[PDB]
Design a protein around this ligand. Sequence first.
Ligand SMILES: *[C@@H]1O[C@H](CO)[C@@H](O)[C@H](O)[C@H]1NC(C)=O
Lengths: 117, 286, 49, 49, 39, 109, 49
Amino acid sequence: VQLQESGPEVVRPGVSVKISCKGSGYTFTDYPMHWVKQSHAKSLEWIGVFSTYNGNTNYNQKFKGKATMTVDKSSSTAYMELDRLTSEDSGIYYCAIGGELSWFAYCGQGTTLTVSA
Amino acid sequence: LGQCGLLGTITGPPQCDQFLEFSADLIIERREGSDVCYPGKFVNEEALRQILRESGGIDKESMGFTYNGIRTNGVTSACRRSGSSFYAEMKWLLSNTDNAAFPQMTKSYKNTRESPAIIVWGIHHSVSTAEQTKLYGSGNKLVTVGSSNYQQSFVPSPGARPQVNGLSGRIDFHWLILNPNDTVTFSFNGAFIAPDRASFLRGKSMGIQSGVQVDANCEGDCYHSGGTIISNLPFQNIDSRAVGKCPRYVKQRSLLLATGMKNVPELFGAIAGFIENGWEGLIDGW
Amino acid sequence: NYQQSFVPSPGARPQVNGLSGRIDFHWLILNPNDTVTFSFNGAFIAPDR
Amino acid sequence: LGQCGLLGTITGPPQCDQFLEFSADLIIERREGSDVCYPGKFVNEEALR
Amino acid sequence: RYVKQRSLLLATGMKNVPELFGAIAGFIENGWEGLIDGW
Amino acid sequence: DIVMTQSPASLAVSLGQRATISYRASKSVSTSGYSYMHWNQQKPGQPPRLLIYLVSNLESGVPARFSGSGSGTDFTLNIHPVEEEDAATYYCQHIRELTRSEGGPSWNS
Amino acid sequence: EVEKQIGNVINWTRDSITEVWSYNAELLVAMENQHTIDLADSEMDKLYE
Ligand SMILES: *[C@@H]1O[C@H](CO)[C@@H](O)[C@H](O)[C@H]1NC(C)=O
């Protein structure tokens, strides 16, 4: 399953940018879709607030009152808007539809978002 | 069953792992038989205890919920096999990250067989509302079990209690019955201990609570808690809960039935009548 | 006599002929010169007879 | 019991203050016997009775 | 009142002896076929 | 959060070899006869990909010449013959017990 | 832990059924004893006359 992100790459710290990952092949079903942050100097963290197939929300620890992940069913792409931006958060955002006991294999190549003023 | 009990044959605590999917024409429950290893009881458990010891066995199928954004191995230090283990046929669906959240899951299972299922599922009565922020996540917890017949929408009781051998959190958990071509949805966003092996039935059996040992060489059908009543006699003063194909309980310990005539030793009037004496020297006839 | 304070179960289920929402509903018995109050702010299917 | 009832022997409403901690080989409940003074009943009260 | 014996036949006549006192199946050793007016 | 130790957190290796490198677990990671520890390959210039689930039961889609191994606490995969396209960064993340946390990483060239 | 009311109901029912059968068992045997001595004294008459 090949799948592509989309989102504007020129954005300021402190304003909102949206992420849009097209889920090819099938819709948001009993397998929902998560997200992963890439940091500088090649380290990861599972920042991805994800939306299940019933419309709820599960943030990271540091990022609870911080974002919103909800599902849209018409475009096979979950809805998210990333406000509050900071130049430390420059990274490539890899969407991933999960299966959780194979792995997050339905994975993305990332649209490189550079967050700087 | 030994350390296993009746209601453990569905749930499979580590004292029941050799009885998970059994077959019987007689189950035998023991006084030491814990139905539980992370402590508690069932809900309407005397109703469920009269089905499972009339089932014959417990045949199973996988349900195959592909749990996602989840964990599977909720293990605790009172269900040991080698180390941290759990019930063989349930899963603590606890969250991805510690205090983050645990979203809604809607999980369906269509019964597709000839027989009525006997499902079971779990709600987690934790000790406090600080464990159910690190196990599952902030917010209220709903487990909604709506079949075609039912609608229940359960909720836990996160209060402290005196300890049964190590922990101040409980679990108590519930059960329905399906009919062929039904479905069961499990809507839940926390505190839910799903099944993974839907349970079926096998036919005829009976079931006894007792405390004495097993004689596989003798045969009988009247099995109370202190043995087996084997005779052809219609009344017993042994136990008033003698289940099986038993005789009928009374309270007179001696009901002597006059399988011979009167003694007159040395309603018609010759037995204790004008024939005034019995005889000692007849053993061939009456 | 009573005090019950009911609450619904908004969960999904397999369908009985068309819908995935249920209703299940309750009943009391009055005695002469009693009263029944119905306090409700949603999800309530009142009687009229 | 009089104005006291059966389930008032635990709870002690003011009609039961001479029966709070009683001793009997026969208790006798009365038709006028309120088990309550701030009104209500118990839950699964026929089991406790 | 429900029972499980499908046939509980209740002896609305006496014994047949065809060709607790002892004359029904006793010293009166034979029934009679040709009486329909009385017992 | 679980801090899984990678040691060595830097190596690169030769052809046809077998390597035993550990992301080691510091918490209670015994259950079910197994651990829920998946791995992923990450090639520099490619998106990552699953390779192992449920240590014995590998996927199809990679050649099966990777061998995730272990029974106990601290786990370690094994490789047999290494080829040219092994030059990648072999992360993983944790899924077995709460919480999720990624690897070190370690290198492979 | 059987339920308090229905356990009293079962004990009301069982001890009734216990008093049903034990009255029946005492009456049956005493009826059968009197009948057995009736059918023991009867074939004195059937033998002696
Ligand atoms: C029922 O009676 C038995 C003995 O006859 C007793 O052991 C049991 O506790 C009783 N149960 C209740 C609920 O009264």
